[PDB]
Amino acid sequence: KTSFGSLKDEDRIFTNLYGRHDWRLKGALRRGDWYKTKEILLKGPDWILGEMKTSGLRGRGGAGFPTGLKWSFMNKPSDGRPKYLVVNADEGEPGTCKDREIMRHDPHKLVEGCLVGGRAMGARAAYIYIRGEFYNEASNLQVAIREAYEAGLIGKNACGSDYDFDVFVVRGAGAYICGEETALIESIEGKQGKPRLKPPFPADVGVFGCPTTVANVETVAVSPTICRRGGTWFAGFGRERNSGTKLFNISGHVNHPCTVEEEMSVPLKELIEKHAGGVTGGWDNLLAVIPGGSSTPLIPKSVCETVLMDFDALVQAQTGLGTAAVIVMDRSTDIVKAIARLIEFYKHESCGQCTPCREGVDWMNKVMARFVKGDARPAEIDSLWEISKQIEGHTICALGDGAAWPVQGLIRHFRPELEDRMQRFAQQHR
Amino acid sequence: PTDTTTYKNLQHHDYNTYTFLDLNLDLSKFRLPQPSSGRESPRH
Amino acid sequence: ASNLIEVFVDGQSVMVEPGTTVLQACEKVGMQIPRFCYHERLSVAGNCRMCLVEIEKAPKVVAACAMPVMKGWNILTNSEKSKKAREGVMEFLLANHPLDCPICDQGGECDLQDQSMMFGSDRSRFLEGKRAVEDKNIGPLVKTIMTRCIQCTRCIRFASEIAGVDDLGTTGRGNDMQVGTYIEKMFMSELSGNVIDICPVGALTSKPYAFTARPWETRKTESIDVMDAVGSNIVVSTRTGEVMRILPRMHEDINEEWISDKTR
Amino acid sequence: GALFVHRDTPENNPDTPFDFTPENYKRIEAIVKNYPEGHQAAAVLPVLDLAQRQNGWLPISAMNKVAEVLQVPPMRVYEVATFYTMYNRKPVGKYHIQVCTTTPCMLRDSDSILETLQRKLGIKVGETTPDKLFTLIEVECLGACVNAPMVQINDNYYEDLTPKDIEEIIDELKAGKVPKPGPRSGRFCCEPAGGLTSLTEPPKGPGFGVQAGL
Numbered sequence A: 001k002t003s004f005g006s007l008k009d010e011d012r013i014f015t016n017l018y019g020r021h022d023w024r025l026k027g028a029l030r031r032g033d034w035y036k037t038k039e040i041l042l043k044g045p046d047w048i049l050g051e052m053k054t055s056g057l058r059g060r061g062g063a064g065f066p067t068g069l070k071w072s073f074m075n076k077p078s079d080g081r082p083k084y085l086v087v088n089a090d091e092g093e094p095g096t097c098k099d100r101e102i103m104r105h106d107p108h109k110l111v112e113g114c115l116v117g118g119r120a121m122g123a124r125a126a127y128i129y130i131r132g133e134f135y136n137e138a139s140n141l142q143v144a145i146r147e148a149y150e151a152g153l154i155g156k157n158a159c160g161s162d163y164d165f166d167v168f169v170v171r172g173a174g175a176y177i178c179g180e181e182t183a184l185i186e187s188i189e190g191k192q193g194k195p196r197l198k199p200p201f202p203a204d205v206g207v208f209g210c211p212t213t214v215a216n217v218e219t220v221a222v223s224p225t226i227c228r229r230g231g232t233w234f235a236g237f238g239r240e241r242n243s244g245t246k247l248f249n250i251s252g253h254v255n256h257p258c259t260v261e262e263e264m265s266v267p268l269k270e271l272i273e274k275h276a277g278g279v280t281g282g283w284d285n286l287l288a289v290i291p292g293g294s295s296t297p298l299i300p301k302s303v304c305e306t307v308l309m310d311f312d313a314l315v316q317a318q319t320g321l322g323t324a325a326v327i328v329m330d331r332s333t334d335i336v337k338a339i340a341r342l343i344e345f346y347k348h349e350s351c352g353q354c355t356p357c358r359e360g361v362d363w364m365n366k367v368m369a370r371f372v373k374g375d376a377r378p379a380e381i382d383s384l385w386e387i388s389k390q391i392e393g394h395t396i397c398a399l400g401d402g403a404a405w406p407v408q409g410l411i412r413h414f415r416p417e418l419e420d421r422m423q424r425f426a427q428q429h430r
Numbered sequence B: 001p002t003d004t005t006t007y008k009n010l011q012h013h014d015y016n017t018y019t020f021l022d023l024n025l026d027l028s029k030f031r032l033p034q035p036s037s038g039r040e041s042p043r044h
Numbered sequence C: 001a002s003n004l005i006e007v008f009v010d011g012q013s014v015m016v017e018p019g020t021t022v023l024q025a026c027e028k029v030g031m032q033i034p035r036f037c038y039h040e041r042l043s044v045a046g047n048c049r050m051c052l053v054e055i056e057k058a059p060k061v062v063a064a065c066a067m068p069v070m071k072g073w074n075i076l077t078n079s080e081k082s083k084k085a086r087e088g089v090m091e092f093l094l095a096n097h098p099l100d101c102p103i104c105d106q107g108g109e110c111d112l113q114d115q116s117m118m119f120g121s122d123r124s125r126f127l128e129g130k131r132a133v134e135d136k137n138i139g140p141l142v143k144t145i146m147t148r149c150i151q152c153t154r155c156i157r158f159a160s161e162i163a164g165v166d167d168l169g170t171t172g173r174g175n176d177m178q179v180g181t182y183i184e185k186m187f188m189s190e191l192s193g194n195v196i197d198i199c200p201v202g203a204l205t206s207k208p209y210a211f212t213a214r215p216w217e218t219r220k221t222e223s224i225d226v227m228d229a230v231g232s233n234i235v236v237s238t239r240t241g242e243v244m245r246i247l248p249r250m251h252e253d254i255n256e257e258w259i260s261d262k263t264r
Numbered sequence D: 001g002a003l004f005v006h007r008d009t010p011e012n013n014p015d016t017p018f019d020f021t022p023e024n025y026k027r028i029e030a031i032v033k034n035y036p037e038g039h040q041a042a043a044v045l046p047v048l049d050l051a052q053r054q055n056g057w058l059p060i061s062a063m064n065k066v067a068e069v070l071q072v073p074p075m076r077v078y079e080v081a082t083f084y085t086m087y088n089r090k091p092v093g094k095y096h097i098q099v100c101t102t103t104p105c106m107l108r109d110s111d112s113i114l115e116t117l118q119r120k121l122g123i124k125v126g127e128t129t130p131d132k133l134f135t136l137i138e139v140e141c142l143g144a145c146v147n148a149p150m151v152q153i154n155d156n157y158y159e160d161l162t163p164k165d166i167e168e169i170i171d172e173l174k175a176g177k178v179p180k181p182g183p184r185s186g187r188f189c190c191e192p193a194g195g196l197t198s199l200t201e202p203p204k205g206p207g208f209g210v211q212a213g214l
């Protein structure tokens, strides 16, 4: 099909998204969780990884890597070391709150997803790393894990499948950088959340120096349904190579900020109007959208008219899908101050390990603060563009890249707005 | 059919400072024996 | 023999063992990659990013100190992308660095000064204020002026691995990350004075040596230590008929790159 | 402001009394057993967090105790305590108010919440009330942006706030009552206000749409 959207409730995965049904095991069973799990497990690693490959599912943490290929790096004979699945529940990207709802209302989807995914990789346990601020969610997830242990669904002889699996919850202590896949591993190991260089890759040398796959909560949570309902069903949504459903956070200047599950490649305009109640003051009041969370560049209103919300369509718009966290700014917004506060976030979140982000992001932050007042000259706009290109591609981890792109999105689409402030500031003093 | 008009995630209003680590303590009995690297530590 | 694999440094074939890094392959053709955090006798860190080098047909530059070479790679150590990576990284290092060279003991034998001359730009476009951090007192031998530190973590890796003292670390994060001990504490290992050599900048300097000499002045006399029976190879720096300081002289089979604090 | 060097004071020094209560020692050995044998430095972040839940904050003696209990070097515990922003290396109020001011919240007027809290408590961000019952700070995104503007007070989130709503929550805490986490706008969590636009139909039950041969 060429038109996407209007997902039906029968096709939705996260059926207790809004917490209107029981989130404990009794409710989860009624909604179809933990159904025929033993059958899925006994079909083996190769079959499970086949379903994920066929579905075309891609990473939901931000980078959108094909999940089935990534999870197959663990499909290798062991070397005497234990194997581990880490579930990334750090969820720290501004604008993103989708993983939070999964853990508090559908915790048994995640636990089963840990087992099915852990089995496919051949792992012995799952470590779920949840941000420390999500204390109530972390406690909901532990209650669900205890219920699954009591019901025999995890632990020794999981689901009666003669396969042992553990599900540990470890809490973070406040660092956005610990959502980066190798910084998360270091934080589990008791160190500062500083990312590792690659190689080695986690599937070779990971947590405790052992083969590891770090997967996003949303990636892990939808896997059991892909196995039950098949990869063909999941591949029936969204454009080719961008398939499946997706959770969207719409925040900022909308009438009804919300979280909603929708099909991939849905038009961005349709998503805001149908679910979020439209832009505050009408579609004509729209200024710019950040379509994938803070790390993705903003797009202007002209691009937003026809852009589809999937991985490839937003790449052609010079932005990215990211965490599918849509942030909306209407024409009353100070666009410069909005992006400057995002640079301020990245400056507060840099781990400090590597030079270009330790120094560069702090440098960009200071220049942006002067751009907000207009206390600069237009020759500095190209200077800031070059500085951001010196960070991008030159850092250990993608935080540095994610700090550069917001600046580039502002310079690309709102250069006249910056130059206009500089003109007003110069005449306001001269 | 479920009521699906009230909010059914209200247990967390009664959680306290040690709710998480009490569940972790309670969950120790179900865990499986951990693997060993062979040394008491990397020697600090 | 059979394990040796073929890589290319600017088109010249080199046969290297598996696990050899890109930085080490360039050494075999006599090309020294710029570096700050990398030191061959310490664990690889990969944090300074001064060693970023372009691999032909790959769009992302790789950290040469940490990246193992793959078969058939052609390492372009002087390509425009390599050169622009070095200029960008050098510019970041010098943004908050203090204008201290006249009063700094490292001046004239400084890897920051020299790799800036050879690989950095010739001017600054940084129009802000600079960071300034407070100084830590770690004993009578090592003076700290930590505003000059470039966060390379060489001292942390020396203290942990060579000296077996887990007292150095980083506190904070971001631009505010500080190298030190957090609490007031002395760094008094028998090998402690070697942090002065391996610190690439004037952040860690010799208290006894402070302000007495410049490196272009000194005459170097290669000699041996007699404070113990190890026979560590040293350099005796003299000026105008006076001994100024003692440096280690590399000898792989005796003292490698280090001396003891009595020797120093 | 917030320094990352420790300097001793009478109230915070290596001899400031700290120990884990016997109940909390049972909780430590459960934490440690979550990890492979010989990899118990992994327990630093939870154990260090437990010391703060017992104590409210972390003096240098509490960090020193964590290092001894886990037999890690103290500098490795200091590195952790200064990296992660949720560790309080100075004492905090009874209620640690944390207001998100990142852009998604800022667009929905987190500035008004911060202004109301300052004038109501009569302090500025980064300060503690003289009676030592509230500390006020600004924080980065707390992962609740659809429910903006919002604050965290200890372990609870209070969301969809207005200046009038935040004043009520402050009155409840002065009284001694627990306000109640969640949105203060009428909705229950993250649903669109004005009725669900999805998941209005009953869930489809076990076995629905299962592929054949499973």
Ligand SMILES: Cc1cc2nc3c(=O)[nH]c(=O)nc-3n(C[C@H](O)[C@H](O)[C@H](O)COP(=O)(O)O)c2cc1C
Binding pocket: A058, A059, A060, A061, A062, A063, A064, A065, A067, A088, A089, A090, A091, A092, A093, A176, A177, A178, A179, A180, A181, A182, A214, A215, A216, A217, A219, A397, A398, A399, A402
């Ligand atoms: C600064 C930074 C923060 C990140 N934060 C998260 C996060 O909070 N949650 C997440 O699933 N991924 C996050 N990622 C992406 C992860 O590194 C990783 O790609 C992902 O968690 C695992 O792959 P997956 O999405 O395919 O499952 C972050 C990356 C960076 C550079």
Ligand code: SF4
Binding pocket: A177, A194, A195, A349, A350, A351, A352, A353, A354, A355, A357, A358, A395, A396, A397, A398, A399, A400, A401
């Ligand atoms: S890019 Fe920033 S967050 Fe990532 S490793 Fe480098 S300094 Fe740390």
Ligand code: SF4
Binding pocket: C097, C098, C099, C100, C101, C102, C104, C105, C106, C107, C108, C110, C111, C112, C113, C148, C200, C201, C202, C203
């Ligand atoms: S460390 Fe080098 S560049 Fe820095 S002040 Fe000293 S001599 Fe100058």
Ligand code: SF4
Binding pocket: C148, C149, C150, C151, C152, C153, C154, C155, C156, C179, C198, C199, C200, C201, C203, C204
């Ligand atoms: S003090 Fe010197 S050796 Fe230590 S991190 Fe700073 S620059 Fe590197």
Ligand code: FES
Binding pocket: C034, C035, C036, C037, C038, C045, C046, C047, C048, C049, C050, C051, C052, C063, C064, C065, C066
């Ligand atoms: S020398 Fe390679 S990054 Fe420092």
Ligand code: FES
Binding pocket: A094, A095, A096, D100, D101, D102, D103, D104, D105, D106, D140, D141, D142, D143, D144, D145, D148, D150
């Ligand atoms: S921007 Fe405030 S909770 Fe995300």
Ligand code: NA
Binding pocket: C106, C196, C197, C198, C199, C200, C201, C202, C203, C204, C205
């Ligand atoms: Na030095």
